[PDB]
Subunit: 46 residues, 2 copies
């Protein structure tokens, strides 16, 4: 699951995945994190 710290991060993350790129790449680019679990930590709620 992807977890972002703010709306900016979610926006970039989403645009990046729509180009076809891998989740860790899009995470790094956006400041979001990829977790293996189903619930995002509280400081990455977006």
């Amino acid at each position: 699951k992807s977890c972002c710290p703010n709306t900016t991060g979610r926006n970039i993350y989403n645009a990046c995945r729509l180009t076809g790129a891998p989740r860790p790449t899009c995470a790094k680019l956006s400041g979001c994190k990829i977790i293996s679990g189903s619930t995002c930590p509280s400081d990455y709620p977006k």
Copy 2:
């Protein structure tokens, strides 16, 4: 080399490349394109 339509694109491509993301991803995310020649096209001057 990379060619960008505008400053916005050049900013994004460069930032993307500093994260280590592949040039085609950074191009898609920025609106820039990669060429094998030396002269950028006039519609991608930045």
